[PDB]
Design a protein around this ligand. Structure first.
Ligand SMILES: O=P(O)(O)OC[C@H]1O[C@H](O)[C@H](O)[C@H](O)[C@@H]1O
Ligand SMILES: O=P(O)(O)OC[C@H]1O[C@H](O)[C@H](O)[C@H](O)[C@@H]1O
Lengths: 156, 156
């Protein structure tokens, strides 16, 4: 049972609703950060930042951000200090986001997948463990340090 | 002809050399930020931060970050202030990254695509114009302001 913060704009809104239901039915705890209704002109960054901020503030939780293409949503989420947001476009990439990047969040482009495909991605994301492998941790650490100082690490 | 800053770790290294060749042959200006050799144990963040930093520092340029899965690489690039790095997993997502997100960078997962698929992704990214549509600019602006102030925009 994972806690999962969900954020979506209008383009991800109906998929977000289906994912909430799916997560409830599969033993997890979805928390809706908005949008709480369909507003055709609404702007994804607020909801992505909301979901990412909550996820980083609640260590051990996960987050999913949803819009049309997934890319703006993950870009926005990655601007939150400490957040690592992968773009999940397949079951394999959702799994690797957890296993290699210890990604707390994924973005999913609601316009790029059928509901069934999207729910399979969600499943992979919420069930795949972080490997804790030394090299993966080292790379996350290097990034975390860069976030702290904004000093670009040297290239060999 | 675009200027394109390229970064890669060992997993994206061979694909990078291939993309450099392709960009030269198609009238563009690639600039290699490393890795300059195959090193099986090397760490993607420095190469991605390097490419993203150079790209943001040179308005009008684009950048491409390359690794195994693409996701760690775009996460790293997105930590650079002002950088918008999309995960390009298809010709469509490469195109929309430019059209909708005015993304200066894409990440590509070398282990996820054939060379021919990757090069078609590259072509879409370096030839698709930014739309400049009001709503897309507004969202990019909202994100830039969050980046500047870390004041999370309010959610309805
Ligand atoms: O405003 P519309 O619905 O056309 O587009 C909204 C979408 O724009 C871009 O594609 C963003 O990456 C994001 O996915 C957002 O959901
Ligand atoms: O160290 P190895 O080669 O197993 O993996 C390296 C890869 O790790 C992760 O997948 C990152 O997202 C990135 O794609 C990197 O290139």
């Amino acid at each position: 049972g994972m806690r999962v913060y969900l954020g979506a704009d209008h383009a991800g809104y109906e998929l977000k609703q289906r994912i909430i239901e799916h997560l409830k039915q599969t033993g997890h705890e979805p928390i809706d950060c908005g949008a709480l209704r369909y507003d055709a002109d609404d702007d994804y960054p607020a909801f992505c930042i909301a979901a990412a901020t909550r996820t980083v503030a609640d260590p051990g939780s996960l987050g999913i951000v949803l819009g049309g293409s997934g890319n703006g949503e993950q870009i926005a989420a990655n601007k939150v200090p400490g957040a690592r947001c992968a773009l999940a476009w397949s079951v394999q990439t959702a799994a690797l986001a957890r296993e290699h990047n210890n990604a707390q969040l994924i973005g999913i482009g609601g316009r790029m997948h059928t509901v069934a495909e999207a729910l399979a991605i969600v499943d992979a994301f919420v069930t795949t463990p972080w490997s804790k492998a030394q090299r993966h941790q080292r790379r996350i650490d290097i990034l975390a340090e860069y976030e702290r100082t904004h000093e670009a690490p040297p290239v060999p």
